Design a protein around this ligand. Structure first.
Ligand code: HEM
Ligand SMILES: CC(C)(C)OC(=O)N[C@@H](CS[C@H](Cc1ccccc1)C(=O)NCCc1cccnc1)Cc1ccccc1
Length: 436
């Protein structure tokens, strides 16, 4: 089984018995992907253990995979376990079951459901300020992910359920998952053991805490179809997904943006200037004033080009296909190396520099949406994209209407990415905060 790509004529690095190419992850997914993209061109293959993985980078082939042939051939992501009752979570679910959850949960993030959440988000930003005004009136460097995650947790639990809890001081969220991929034949062993990559105690906290809400929103819109069709432990699982997403991703990106705003002071001023012009007198941001702000959008986009928190997009090939003139056999994992495409010199001038002018309306048309895919694409892209962009931007507006951000002696400059598996910084993001 380590001969597949040698036979297909697809180039790629030579695998070791059993491990495949996984020793190559010692420097991280993204470095390996960049290295392959440059050694091998537009297409290559490698092996996670015994699992063949075909990397593609052609914009047309990517659109075919994410969009043109999604329902028919590339419907699911790579199996990932042991998951337990979380198998029914939307982003883990497969084929017809995912289809049903997608259709069931899509009405949560409309322009009209988002627009109802702006008045309610508007409270925790003010908490976020006062929490920050304290750690500022005392010239003590601030950990952004702590105070951002605090605010993120606040918005999520209320956007979907209705629970309000000053997020300060709950909040429960590469050593072993390694063995999953040399030993994925061990996943079904672990499922029959109830063994879970979510420690059985974090989920047991909510295997009742959702039943405990309450009862007598995302939570609302689910019961209406609970009363085919719908369930309830399946309701707790969707909730856990949403609660992770809104906490960890929203807070992690906010921290990346503030780092870049701090290492590029002219961009921070330019942004504070735009916010005060749309929102004079520190006017409260509304749903519409957020979408009005173009440089805020450019800043956000440009951070997600540098720090795309998914790193790779993946789809299981569920049957033989010949896409854009190339044969792909059943079972291959097809992979888009997003981090690499975001930093590819053959699309982006000076790709390591934080330059938000790449996304000006003057320039944003030179940007292939199948190269720059921070939220995915096609029927299976990020279901929370608009809620996420809006959530962050309201945090940013409120925050920058009050404070500026400078580097500190301990600010890691330049910021190293974690060689681990998740797009995080090695050292946490600390910066000096000053009150306008
Ligand atoms: C800046 C924040 C976020 C980013 C960059 C992001 C990005 C992504 C990406 C790249 C995917 C995979 C798409 C694909 O494979 O084509 C995804 C999937 C998903 N995201 Fe997010 N996301 C963010 C925040 C959120 C939030 C706040 C939610 C809240 C519900 C959310 C819910 C989901 C779900 C449910 C999926 C699975 C979609 C499916 O399998 O049908 N995401 N996200
Ligand atoms: C750990 C590793 C990076 C190797 O592979 C995973 O990423 N595996 C997840 C399985 S689930 C799903 C998948 C996903 C999401 C975004 C991009 C690519 C793949 C998911 O939407 N997750 C919920 C929150 C979220 C995160 C990012 C963007 N949008 C939403 C990790 C996971 C498992 C169980 C609970 C929470 C997270």
């Amino acid at each position: 089984s380590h001969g597949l790509f040698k036979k297909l004529g697809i180039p790629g690095p030579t695998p070791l018995p059993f491990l495949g190419n996984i020793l190559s992850y010692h420097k991280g997914f993204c470095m390996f992907d960049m290295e392959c993209h440059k050694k091998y061109g537009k297409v290559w293959g490698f092996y996670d253990g015994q699992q063949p993985v075909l990397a593609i980078t052609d914009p047309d082939m990517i659109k075919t995979v994410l969009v043109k042939e999604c329902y028919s051939v590339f419907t699911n992501r790579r199996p990932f376990g042991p998951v337990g009752f979380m198998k029914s979570a939307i982003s883990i679910a497969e084929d017809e079951e995912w289809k049903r959850l997608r259709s069931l949960l899509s009405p949560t993030f409309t322009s009209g459901k988002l627009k109802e959440m702006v008045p309610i988000i508007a409270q925790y930003g003010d908490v976020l300020v006062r929490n920050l005004r304290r750690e500022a009136e005392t010239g003590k460097p601030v950990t952004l992910k702590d105070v951002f995650g605090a605010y993120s947790m606040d918005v999520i639990t209320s956007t979907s359920f209705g629970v309000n809890i000053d997020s300060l001081n709950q909040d429960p969220f590469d050593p072993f998952f390694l063995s999953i991929t040399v030993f994925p034949f061990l996943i079904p062993i672990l499922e029959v053991l109830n063994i879970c990559v979510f420690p059985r105690e974090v989920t047991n906290f909510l295997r009742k805490s959702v039943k405990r809400m309450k009862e007598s929103d995302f939570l609302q819109l689910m019961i209406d179809s609970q009363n085919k069709a719908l369930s309830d432990l399946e309701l707790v699982a969707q909730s856990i997904i949403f609660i992770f997403a809104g906490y960890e991703t929203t807070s992690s990106v906010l921290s990346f943006i503030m780092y870049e705003l701090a290492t590029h002071p002219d961009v921070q001023q330019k942004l504070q200037e735009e916010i005060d012009a749309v929102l004079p007198n520190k006017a409260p941001p509304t749903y519409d004033t957020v979408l009005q702000m173009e440089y805020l959008d450019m800043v956000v986009n440009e951070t997600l080009r540098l720090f795309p928190i998914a790193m790779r997009l993946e789809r299981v090939c569920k049957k033989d296909v010949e896409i854009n003139g190339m044969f792909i056999p059943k079972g291959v994992v097809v992979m888009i190396p997003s981090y690499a495409l975001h930093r590819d010199p053959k699309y982006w001038t000076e790709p390591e520099k934080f330059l938000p002018e790449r996304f000006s309306k003057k320039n944003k048309d030179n940007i292939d949406p199948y190269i720059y895919t921070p939220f995915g694409s096609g029927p299976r892209n990020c279901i929370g994209m608009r809620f996420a962009l809006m959530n962050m931007k309201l945090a940013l507006i409120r925050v920058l209407q009050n404070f500026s951000f400078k580097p500190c002696k301990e600010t890691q400059i330049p910021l190293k990415l974690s060689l681990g598996g998740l797009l995080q910084p090695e050292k946490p993001v600390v910066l000096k905060v000053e009150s306008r």
